[PDB]
Design a protein around this ligand. Sequence first.
Ligand SMILES: *[C@@H]1O[C@H](CO)[C@@H](O[C@@H]2O[C@H](CO)[C@@H](O)[C@H](O)[C@H]2NC(C)=O)[C@H](O)[C@H]1NC(C)=O
Lengths: 99, 50
Amino acid sequence: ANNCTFEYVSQPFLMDLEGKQGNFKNLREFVFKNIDGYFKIYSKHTPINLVRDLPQGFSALEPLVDLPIGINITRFQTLLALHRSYLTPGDSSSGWTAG
Amino acid sequence: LKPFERDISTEIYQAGSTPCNGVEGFNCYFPLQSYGFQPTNGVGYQPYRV
Ligand SMILES: *[C@@H]1O[C@H](CO)[C@@H](O[C@@H]2O[C@H](CO)[C@@H](O)[C@H](O)[C@H]2NC(C)=O)[C@H](O)[C@H]1NC(C)=O
């Protein structure tokens, strides 16, 4: 159920995914913390050239969003989404072939 | 408490070393308390909006 009170949504909707297996040229960074209950999330994006490992250089990070969450925080898990067409017999929970 | 945080709990706080399933026991008191502001009470117990 919802059982929730806080909302913050901005919807400049636009579609761009471009399912590819090529060398990585897009990289995101998000840093998460909280001070005095104010949850602060700092965001950055940059292009790179390497394909497999982590591109080691130097860059910067800037703050993007702040929230008054006021809640005990101990754990976190990321979110992933992938489902194949009729071609894959393995279902969404079972099969996927575009990692 | 960590400043500016909301405690949203229902489980009974263990007093007197009592594992309680929301139940009573040897000094196993309810985690919540409700103010008994009888209408038109005394000043020391009159309700205030803060
Ligand atoms: C936030 O949640 C954590 C649970 O991850 C709480 O940590 C527990 O604190 C009690 C205090 O008596 C301990 O008995 C438990 O052993 C702790 N659990 C773990 C997994 O370490 C924590 O108290 C909560 N509140 C705050 C303000 O951090």
